[PDB]
């Protein structure tokens, strides 16, 4: 008899144990959480507006000929502003994939610029990490620009940039313009305007969303905290809740503000989680602001929101798409529980199941490889020919990589977890492809964390078998109750 | 048909893939690698000499009544110099176990001093991490002192220390004396003297050791790099190789220096891995030193040793018990491959197999718990009574913790990996209970890394199953060859 | 005899020696350098627009009753975002003046929040230094807000902020809104619009400016480097050169661009001094940009955008040694931390005009403080460690305190920009670090030849300034506790000559 | 008239004002404070033992031919472990003197390794500052080693070290062996043994020391805080008080312990000023330690071990305000960075004895430099930006360089401890930061009453020292580019009076 689990595309995955019965408040991000933007239409829109901004700022007209390719970028890549490389790294800074423009650099060639295949993530001045879903157009745009100036006769390829005659143009300064142009497109309203004049093309609409939020408000409180203003929030949220019937069958429609006990616009994260700004009330009918204490607020801080709701830290589950540093934990008051929305998880779960032949063949090659060394020890002079097997492993592994995209899986490359995956294991108590998967779990559910096995755990059976004394080293009242309570959330 | 694996207590576990055929040099630490000290006799000896040093420095005579208890300490604990706590933390600074003296603090009581059950490891001034095998006596000694002054009428318990009348004594200043006393015991020769006057009581002796080192020297080079001087190294290494016969059956004995192409004493690690000191030759027959370039050297640096052997970075496998920071990788030349000796792995593998009933019962409780929620979703008002099941899970989990010791497993507490385990996954390419497990592997073996599965990988079958558009988001030449080569070591 | 010196209000003061003969390129900032803004008119304009912006985003209407008081703020104050205090500190972080709102905290009361009368300047999370001339309205606004919320009964005063009912408003959060509002005023054109629509009210004009710049271009190159766009620069620069003549009266007028070899707008300082942005040449006829440099006929233009200080060096064909950069801003140790040669610096400190007036027209106060100090030494004369006397000095100290306070108020409520009492301010030490030369205005260079050798004045330590170069005949032998019983052919340094 | 001042060699110089009347506790370091070591005898003893230690661990025999040269090192030099240079820098990291071995690098050649003539002092991995008097032999040894390996043909000179055949020896690695050897000399008793076996040769004795300390204990408390053990302290202190009389001649001798209220050995500075170690009272009769304080009859002892500065404050019942700590070491911003009140500081700078002699007995050199500077101003008199003249000053500059170099050599090969030319050294700025008072020796306090008010001297900026307090009548109006067209009741600071 095996353990029961819900369907794979309906599950909420557990990183740290969480008792849902103790949750009193449900907090939501808006962008890419409640308002899931259609891929790759939204990435293509941000890509176009950023290219237009760069062209209107002095960049050549050939950039207008670029088109966003959703098959290339993968979230969490590191851009080397010194050499103009997009880097896929592991949890400790080791290099997994290195792309200069559109050319993927092989192993021995990589050691010319990275002698130990290692980068220091601390070097924030040199390395820029593209972790957000808004960074997806920026990720592909950086590759197009490095590719363009590298294969352009008017420019001269160099180690740290390009030459336009007797004038040098570094990757760092070029990266600055791309950074300023993306900030411009987002903070000038160019992207917001094109979005709210065509919600059906860019914003996903689902009736499951008002159903889950209504059930959350029956067992506790629900609040919204978005960096966007109220105007853009009102248009987006009205679209997300525009249905002829209400949540329950046969019921009538009610405004989206009815599902929230507290609505907070202009959050200004991540400053929001520290001191933030002064909290000010918002008059929706007029747009007038007034500091101090309706349900629509502006600015403030996460602690001010925590106090207005009468909740405490661990009573809140914050649901969003963003990964934040250990700045909320460093506070002297309790931090929130986290639910990380990872939209890529939908396509990655399809590869995990609908490509079983690639996984099964990969395991068969490893069993066959282990048989060739089955009879060998430190006295064996033999060297079994594995060139044919390894060459087949690399082909199958690469075919699996291309199932996710040119940059491979978001969570791993081969046997190594990516830097992004380790940041998920750090920040997210729970994670899924969408917050809507909570609809398939009771509000009294006990989310239990799955053990993450080390090599000496996953490759050793619990079955019972002289041992060398070099390993055994020749081999206060004890507690009677459990010394830890991080698996029951009690 | 299942994959073949060698016996569990003979295996070398693979963190990152390593092709042994490419290794040309084998580097060895001496302490706790070649010279494995008998437990708990060696920890008890260092505990006694440190207590005597503290008593001879002004500490009360009651400390002489303490005896080292091997069942209490576990390597990798964090000592909070502000509150005098031994802390077992995870990879991200979250608290798992908290002990003040010998009293284990429960959950809600811990949040008084740690509001988010979180510490900042960056605070090196406040938090001291006890990662070495030499820190084991120090770990238990800190608990004895906190326990002693807490339950002593002559002193007054406080938050950050104790009161001896109108005089305050903080945990930080007390920790300083323990730190200075351990340095004194090691660097005064008190521990070295008691060791070399009774090698059979404190040092493990094994004939497998000269056999493996001889086979290493037949396929490549072997070097030694120890912080100890030549006098202590000569006595220890002569003991380790004192056998009537040589390595091969019927062969005769030859000196221990014959197994090494280069012997380096006074390494002065970790400075050794940077600029180190000036390399100086050592005359063994006289003890005279001379800077510049026998096989016995003193001081130097890891790059000087790398050049004397004619080897390059990845051609070397450094075998030792110590975990070093990302200082060797930051160099502009290639770093070494690593083999981490973890002596605790011998006892931990026994618990993994000889306690199968505890693991099986723990899995049965989780299957039974999943059945109670099998029919529930976000509409279910029911709250299944799990108080009896959880109370049983905590008892079984605690019984498993006590199998490793009062502080639990070195690698995990419950479902969370310890800070020590994540440092193993970062630094060690390979790890085992001893370097002697290489004797059961051919020098052409391809050590292949085992995938470390995330929750969404280990709890989802590859078997094939409308999906919500909130999760799917309404869904450059591609490379033809593999984009990464960190699984074949090529 | 005595050394000749030019008139005090025409002087250029020298921190480090500089041979003007070797300067082949002259660089200019625009704001508060070439375009000197009227005081206190321009400060009050920024104050109004910033208060207006705060009220539009929810701050109470009582802020509209605030009026900028030019007699309160001194540049270079530190705002403690934890306790809401404006702090005047010395070069090492010691507290000199502490003001909570408009209330000045004195002596023992300061130790409640600052036990050692000391702050850690490195704690940039807590302390914000208001060094720029654009920070002057921001400095006075921060004091107005702290004073208003303290006095207004609608708010309860706490140690680190105020309580508005159940809501706590920290000083740090209030400071954030002030910074956001100041940036909004500058970076939404509201300040630029009011400036260009009344340039006679806000911008100073002087006919000596084209004359001095024309003489600079006769001996070398001249360039402009500003963070403003070309549109605002054109309106400002055309105004500064709007005279019915050229450099000399009677000569023909010529456009302001003719006075420069390179015009760099959108500089993006201080990022300009590192990697900056991609250099793009501006077509003033069209306004369109193009990265790099034009190749056709438009290459004869001199207007560029973005770029970096290294790129401007390459365009001018000038090494950093040969460049004198003239501006009002103090930059950190970055331009010299590189491997490329950094620029020489001329710092514009407009407050020097007023401070030099106090230094000369208030000689009565300086003479009395010296008299009181001479009389103090007389009371302790012929006293040593065996003397039991305790001369009554409380009468003299009260006169010292009274005369010293009257001197401070000659500069304003926060005192002199450079010192408070006998201690130099944090601002004064940063002038010493950054500036090779400094003056109230770059226009004082009009009174020096371009062959002039600016020789640095010695900054004397206490044992140098209070001891004469006279043979001290000691009858009793010097204590061996002090003497420890102790009984190259060419010069090894060259920073006072600058002749490499 | 003129202000009265005590004789220059008896003066105590004042950086920050200090009312001695409020000082209730006097703290003393021992090494180079109470126990002033003979110069250059003690430096040469440390040099020999350090060279001897290096040779015993493999360094070549030619090092035994080295002889300490007291005329070479100046305190406070920076050793560049990358390029093997000794650097004399100013308060901001600008290079003044660069010496590779015994070769002084001048002017343009310095820019090869230091392109902006600048170092980043924060790079403690690369730069090591030799501030202490114990660093004096270490300073000269580093130059000897660089010079030897450069000249010896057995080694090939590289940019960052030397090649001994196929082995590269970096300057950083060589510097590590020097530091290890210096610590080994001090912390293995070899220097203590040679010191105590010949105290007349290495330690200065003066009868004024017990007199001054006895007068201090009449007006307050006196304590000792040293890193040395009690055994070495007893031998040293008994020597310093070994006279056939007490404080005054004709009075009875009494043990040195009678002059103190608290004796703190094994201080573990600078850790002492933070958390330190556990305080333990020493039983001088037995030598055994005991944490805390004795409760029986032994509580009347005054000898303690370890502890912290806060604990010593509590034992003396003294707030940090009331304590004047007298020593030779400069500490960073830590004692005042706490929440507890820090100590006032008296810095002992024994080099002042020699530097004051140069300042007075070499007045001919100062008078000529002033004459040359007056004549330089005369050549440029009546010249402005329109003048095309270029007066010949190369003759005067060579005389300025020659006279300046002769002045530097009066201090030694590395020049004065406090300045090089017109720029203060990095050491001088640290004296300004740390020390409230300073002198060649604490014994100069013998010439001041305990009611004396030490008043800080103004450290004048260029625009204050080169401008008189005289009304400047300007006929032409001041340029509005400089003036910007601009037309509390009690004192707000108290650091010059110190009367809280």
Curated annotation (Swiss-Prot), chains A, B:
Modification type Phosphoserine: residues: 388, 468
Entry EC no(s): 3.1.3.5, 3.1.3.99, 2.7.1.77
Catalytic activity field: a ribonucleoside 5'-phosphate + H2O = a ribonucleoside + phosphate; a 2'-deoxyribonucleoside + a ribonucleoside 5'-phosphate = a ribonucleoside + a 2'-deoxyribonucleoside 5'-phosphate; IMP + H2O = inosine + phosphate; GMP + H2O = guanosine + phosphate
Superkingdom as given in the UniProt entry: Eukaryota
Gene Ontology CC annotations of this record: cytoplasm; cytosol
GO BP annotation list: adenosine metabolic process; allantoin metabolic process; amide catabolic process; dGMP catabolic process; dGMP metabolic process; GMP catabolic process to guanine; GMP metabolic process; IMP catabolic process
Gene3D superfamilies membership: HAD superfamily/HAD-like
Residues annotated for adenosine 1 binding in this entry: 131, 423
Molecular function as annotated in GO: 5'-nucleotidase activity; ATP binding; GMP 5'-nucleotidase activity; identical protein binding; IMP 5'-nucleotidase activity; metal ion binding; nucleoside phosphotransferase activity; ubiquitin protein ligase activity
Cofactor mode of binding and number, as noted: Binds 1 Mg(2+) ion per subunit.
Disulphide-bonded residues: none
Main location: cytoplasm
Family: Belongs to the 5'(3')-deoxyribonucleotidase family.
UniProt-recorded name of the protein: Cytosolic purine 5'-nucleotidase
């Amino acid at each position: 008899l095996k353990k029961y689990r819900r369907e794979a595309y309906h599950r909420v995955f557990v990183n740290r144990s969480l008792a849902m019965e103790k949750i009193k408040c449900f907090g939501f991000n808006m962008d890419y959480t409640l308002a899931v933007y259609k891929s790759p239409e939204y990435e293509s829109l941000g890509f176009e507006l950023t290219v237009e901004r760069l062209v209107s700022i002095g960049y050549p007209q050939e950039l207008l000929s670029f088109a966003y390719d959703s098959t290339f970028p993968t979230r969490g890549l590191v851009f080397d502003t010194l050499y103009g490389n997009l880097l896929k790294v592991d949890a400790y800074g080791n290099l997994l994939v290195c792309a200069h423009g559109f050319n993927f650099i092989r192993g021995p060639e990589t050691r010319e610029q990275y002698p130990n295949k290692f980068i220091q993530r601390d070097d924030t001045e040199r390395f820029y990490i593209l972790n957000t879903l808004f960074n997806l157009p920026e990720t592909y745009l950086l590759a197009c620009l490095v590719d363009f100036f590298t294969n352009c006769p008017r420019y001269t390829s160099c180690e740290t940039g390009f030459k336009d005659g007797d004038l040098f143009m570094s990757y760092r300064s070029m990266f600055q313009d791309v950074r300023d142009a993306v900030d411009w497109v987002h903070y000038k309203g160019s992207l917001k305007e094109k979005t709210v004049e065509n919600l059906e093309k860019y914003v996903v609409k689902d009736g499951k969303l008002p159903l889950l939020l209504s059930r959350m408000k029956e067992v506790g409180k629900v609040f919204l905290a978005t960096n966007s203003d109220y105007k853009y929030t009102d248009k987006i949220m009205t679209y997300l809740f525009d249905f002829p019937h209400g949540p329950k069958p046969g019921s009538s429609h009610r405004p989206w503000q009815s599902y929230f006990d507290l609505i907070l616009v202009d959050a200004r994260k991540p400053l929001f989680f520290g001191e933030g700004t002064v909290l000010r009330q918002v008059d929706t009918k007029t747009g007038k602001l007034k500091i101090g204490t309706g349900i629509v607020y502006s600015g403030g801080s996460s602690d001010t929101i925590c106090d207005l709701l009468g909740a405490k830290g661990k009573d809140i589950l914050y649901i969003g798409d963003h990964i934040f540093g250990d700045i909320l934990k460093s506070k002297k008051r309790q931090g929130w529980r986290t639910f990380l929305v990872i939209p890529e998880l939908a396509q990655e779960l399809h590869v995990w199941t609908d490509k079983s032949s690639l996984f099964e063949e990969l395991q068969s090659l490893d069993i066959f490889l282990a048989e060739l060394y089955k009879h060998l020890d430190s006295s064996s002079n033999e060297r079994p020919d594995i060139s044919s097997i390894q060459r087949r492993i690399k082909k199958v592994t690469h075919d699996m990589d291309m199932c996710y995209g040119m940059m491979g899986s978001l969570f791993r490359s081969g046997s190594r977890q990516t830097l992004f995956a380790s940041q998920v294991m750090r920040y997210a108590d729970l994670y899924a492809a969408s917050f809507i998967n909570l609809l398939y779990y009771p509000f009294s559910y006990l989310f239990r964390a799955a053990h993450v096995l080390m090599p000496h755990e996953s490759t050793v059976e619990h079955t019972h078998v002289m041992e060398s004394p070099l390993a055994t080293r020749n081999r206060p009242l004890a507690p009677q109750e459990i010394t830890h309570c991080h698996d029951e959330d009690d």
